Amino acid sequence: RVSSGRDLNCVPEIADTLGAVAKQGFDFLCMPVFHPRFKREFIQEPAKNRPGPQTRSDLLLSGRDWNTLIVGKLSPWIRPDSKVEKIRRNSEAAMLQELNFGAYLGLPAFLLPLNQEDNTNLARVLTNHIHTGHHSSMFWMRVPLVAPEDLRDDIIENAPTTHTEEYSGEEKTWMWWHNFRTLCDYSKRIAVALEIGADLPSNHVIDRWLGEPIKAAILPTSIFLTNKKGFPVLSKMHQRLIFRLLKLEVQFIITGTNHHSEKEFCSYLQYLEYLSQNRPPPNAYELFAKGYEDYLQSPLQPLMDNLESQTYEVFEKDPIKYSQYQQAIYKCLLDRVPEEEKDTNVQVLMVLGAGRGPLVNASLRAAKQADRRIKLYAVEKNPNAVVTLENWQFEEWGSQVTVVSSDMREWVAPEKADIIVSELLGSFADNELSPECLDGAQHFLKDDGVSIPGEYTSFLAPISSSKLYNEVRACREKDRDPEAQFEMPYVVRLHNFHQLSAPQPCFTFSHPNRDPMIDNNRYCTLEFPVEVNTVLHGFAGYFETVLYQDITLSIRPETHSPGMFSWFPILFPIKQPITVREGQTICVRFWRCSNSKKVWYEWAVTAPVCSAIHNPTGRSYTIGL
Amino acid sequence: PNAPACMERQLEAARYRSDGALLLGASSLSGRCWAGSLWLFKDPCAAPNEGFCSAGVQTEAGVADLTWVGERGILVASDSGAVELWELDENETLIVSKFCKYEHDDIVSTVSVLSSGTQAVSGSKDICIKVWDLAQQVVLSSYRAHAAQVTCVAASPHKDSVFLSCSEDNRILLWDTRCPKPASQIGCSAPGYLPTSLAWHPQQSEVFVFGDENGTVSLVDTKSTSCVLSSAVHSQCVTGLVFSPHSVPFLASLSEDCSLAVLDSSLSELFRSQAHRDFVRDATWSPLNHSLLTTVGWDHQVVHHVVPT
Numbered sequence A: 001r002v003s004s005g006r007d008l009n010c011v012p013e014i015a016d017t018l019g020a021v022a023k024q025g026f027d028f029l030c031m032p033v034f035h036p037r038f039k040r041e042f043i044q045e046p047a048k049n050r051p052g053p054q055t056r057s058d059l060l061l062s063g064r065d066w067n068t069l070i071v072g073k074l075s076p077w078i079r080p081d082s083k084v085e086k087i088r089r090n091s092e093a094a095m096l097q098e099l100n101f102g103a104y105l106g107l108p109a110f111l112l113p114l115n116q117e118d119n120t121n122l123a124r125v126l127t128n129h130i131h132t133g134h135h136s137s138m139f140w141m142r143v144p145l146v147a148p149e150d151l152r153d154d155i156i157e158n159a160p161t162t163h164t165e166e167y168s169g170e171e172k173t174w175m176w177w178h179n180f181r182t183l184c185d186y187s188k189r190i191a192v193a194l195e196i197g198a199d200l201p202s203n204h205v206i207d208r209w210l211g212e213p214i215k216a217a218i219l220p221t222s223i224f225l226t227n228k229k230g231f232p233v234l235s236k237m238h239q240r241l242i243f244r245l246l247k248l249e250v251q252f253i254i255t256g257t258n259h260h261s262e263k264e265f266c267s268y269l270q271y272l273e274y275l276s277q278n279r280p281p282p283n284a285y286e287l288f289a290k291g292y293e294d295y296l297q298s299p300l301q302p303l304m305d306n307l308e309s310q311t312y313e314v315f316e317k318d319p320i321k322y323s324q325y326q327q328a329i330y331k332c333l334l335d336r337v338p339e340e341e342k343d344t345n346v347q348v349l350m351v352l353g354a355g356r357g358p359l360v361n362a363s364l365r366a367a368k369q370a371d372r373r374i375k376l377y378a379v380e381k382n383p384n385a386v387v388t389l390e391n392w393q394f395e396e397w398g399s400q401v402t403v404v405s406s407d408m409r410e411w412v413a414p415e416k417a418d419i420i421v422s423e424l425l426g427s428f429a430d431n432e433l434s435p436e437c438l439d440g441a442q443h444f445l446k447d448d449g450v451s452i453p454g455e456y457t458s459f460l461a462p463i464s465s466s467k468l469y470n471e472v473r474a475c476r477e478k479d480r481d482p483e484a485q486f487e488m489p490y491v492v493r494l495h496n497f498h499q500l501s502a503p504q505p506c507f508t509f510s511h512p513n514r515d516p517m518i519d520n521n522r523y524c525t526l527e528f529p530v531e532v533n534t535v536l537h538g539f540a541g542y543f544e545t546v547l548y549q550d551i552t553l554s555i556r557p558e559t560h561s562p563g564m565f566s567w568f569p570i571l572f573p574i575k576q577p578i579t580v581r582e583g584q585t586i587c588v589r590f591w592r593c594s595n596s597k598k599v600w601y602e603w604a605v606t607a608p609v610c611s612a613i614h615n616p617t618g619r620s621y622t623i624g625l
Numbered sequence B: 001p002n003a004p005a006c007m008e009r010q011l012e013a014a015r016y017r018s019d020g021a022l023l024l025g026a027s028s029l030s031g032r033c034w035a036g037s038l039w040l041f042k043d044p045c046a047a048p049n050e051g052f053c054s055a056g057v058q059t060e061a062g063v064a065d066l067t068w069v070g071e072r073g074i075l076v077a078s079d080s081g082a083v084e085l086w087e088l089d090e091n092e093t094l095i096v097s098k099f100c101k102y103e104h105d106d107i108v109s110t111v112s113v114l115s116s117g118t119q120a121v122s123g124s125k126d127i128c129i130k131v132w133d134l135a136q137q138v139v140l141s142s143y144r145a146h147a148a149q150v151t152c153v154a155a156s157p158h159k160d161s162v163f164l165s166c167s168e169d170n171r172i173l174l175w176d177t178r179c180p181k182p183a184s185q186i187g188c189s190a191p192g193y194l195p196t197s198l199a200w201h202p203q204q205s206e207v208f209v210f211g212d213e214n215g216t217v218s219l220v221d222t223k224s225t226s227c228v229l230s231s232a233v234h235s236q237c238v239t240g241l242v243f244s245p246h247s248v249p250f251l252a253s254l255s256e257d258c259s260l261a262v263l264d265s266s267l268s269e270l271f272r273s274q275a276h277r278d279f280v281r282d283a284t285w286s287p288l289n290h291s292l293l294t295t296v297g298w299d300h301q302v303v304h305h306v307v308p309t
């Protein structure tokens, strides 16, 4: 359940070294395509004409071996950011040479070091290489958690290490990475190979790499311990970090020599793989939604569109969600009719937006266990789902369920509603126009009628995710505004992200609205205290809803309804990422706008730096009325 | 002669011992098999010729550096992350390994035996410097003072507890295991081009020379920490620095511009040899006559230069 790699910087013979690495239990091998000590001269005339092959044959491995087993390493002497010019241009021509040989071999990944602050000329040559051919190979940048200058032993008399807390200086390696990728314009082929030090840094420094495209974790043999039995082990602190990585499904890579006579590299993995089993399988919600991690989708629009048969099916694969509805109705039924009026007072229940009728059946089970009599209207506008309803009224429901095929805003009802039941809420609560729908349907709800859900609330929280920022950035399509993908929300099971503040309420709607004058236009102004240095990429959205009384449904992480995978969080992006210092406040503003044809969201950032107003006039995203 | 068929192209080090026998260390930096070997030639003129050798064994990985241990022992800085000690037999025909300890996590780049002959210091690309006990095959101390791969370590003469070390963190560290903080940085090279080579002066306890990557050679009085005397000797990284065994030693520099140069006390220039076509890697003067200086290269030549004193 763990994919691991072996980092070597010494191969005498590929086929004999790779065969060794394979038997020990490794999925791939990181090795130098060129001899690490083979400095080559490209300009200077005595040494430019060095004879012989510049490296070993490609024939030493099969085609699929290079494609799936081998991760290239760029030679340690390549220093394109050197202060000496001759070293710069040799490093330039040689970095291109090594990189071009990796693409020649079809290697899936290439390792590049980020061991100093300035890799500007490094980023450049790399970028040109990315923009020469159109390829999909990845580039793993080695960046350690703690810089080599901040880990050195305090054994120099006249240069003692700084014992003070450099809060932003302890995060300095992240700045190496951030500046590198920003120079490379967020190329999808450039990911992080995080090197784990013997002694870990501060918690914020580790938190810094939340949301970053970490494809690999480097585990040197030196950071391992020795249990009472004499085998390599890891501290609880270190183990927690690995557990955190396990959640991102990074590949785990061992580097350095093994100091144990009891030798054998499998033990180092034996403990590592061992850890995966120890991590609890599954987290319940995680099992079902696997493969949807960080997967961008357009939010469903049941009103404007007609949902397919299999999206109604996934809706029903959540009993927990309906139990709350069942219970809310249950509780409500008892409240409205007393025990002596039980068999005389029949209640008009109306499932507005019945779909394939899970709500109508939950309304039936609620009436049975409440021992009160109900007349039930199943109202659905999607003609295709109505076919399921009418087949299921005829076969089993009978005349207790009346199926109505119309829009609830248009539908004239024969009877007034004792209770109306709605499932209209979206990921961001009202993004599915549940307000406008239930509003136009209040007229057939009697004056003391209960609407389920009574209210719902949208929540917002700023997030940091360079991973997710590329995916939106990759969403550009032809025949449309090149930035329109940034001005539209997405429903997505957020995974590799970092929440930057506690979710705050955004919009609220109460049904029945009543009010002399109903207006679903909204202005809400939020301020999010941020206690860490970071980069703002977007705002995650959740919702809480109160079906009736205490019963509720929620995807807000603090009050997340346990065991409910029915809804995913929504993500509002911003065109340009915004850097945020510790102690700064993220002020965001959101608008719910509407005309007579459509409803949309506008949003902007007025915090540390202003951001353009997103989706103005609904130019890039509408919710059709 | 109980030796491998051919040796590898990249001659990486050449050392003379007391009696005049030439030690050779070569690695296969390119090709199918990346390994190394150790060679001894009691005749120095037939050194590049495998069949005309006195001894010859063949090691697992590349020989990044070597040094003599006494008169019948070779300490090896091997690519495999290990330091290796090989020792001739009594007949001096077979070279057998004494130990092979894998303590460095990267290429062992440099190694130097101390004045006591019982200890040796090694530097590697893992930034760690280790103190070795060559009798108990163990590491005496794990020093991690630099922040970049260690380029050169040079044991002090007549001081079994002092040695030099230079890394790509632009630092030169004067070491003394007697002090609580055993390392002492040299403030001269505050903006200096990265140091690449180190050589103590034989006669003086506090005098040593370093070579930077811009081809500049400078000698420093260590005790005074005063302004050094500098001279642009080469056009590439200065690979190594050796002093002649004379009473007034000449300074022989060698760099990646494929040229060997010999200097005096004021670092003036007496002799270049352009004879090498590739990188020059090591220098060792003949102790039998003191005007011969032989240097190897990656062009697989050994060149016996006559140093015109």
Ligand SMILES: Nc1nc2cnc(C(=O)N3CCOC[C@@H]3c3ccc(C(F)(F)F)cc3)cc2c2c1COC2
Pocket: A288, A289, A290, A292, A297, A300, A302, A314, A315, A423, A424, A425, A426, A427, A432, A491, A565, A566, A567, A568, A569
């Ligand atoms: N009116 C509604 N709107 C919704 C909009 N979106 C969603 C929503 O999150 N997903 C539906 C569309 O794919 C994304 C997402 C999803 C995908 C897979 C899974 C799986 F397989 F893991 F379980 C779960 C969720 C749910 C809605 C619901 C209602 C009524 O109750 C549910």
Ligand SMILES: CSC[C@H]1O[C@@H](n2cnc3c(N)ncnc32)[C@H](O)[C@@H]1O
Pocket: A302, A303, A305, A306, A307, A315, A352, A353, A354, A355, A379, A380, A381, A382, A385, A406, A407, A408, A409, A423, A424, A437
């Ligand atoms: C389970 S999703 C909620 C259901 O309500 C339906 N729905 C949405 N809006 C309306 C409406 N105005 N009238 C009737 N059904 C609706 C949607 O099509 C969906 O099947």
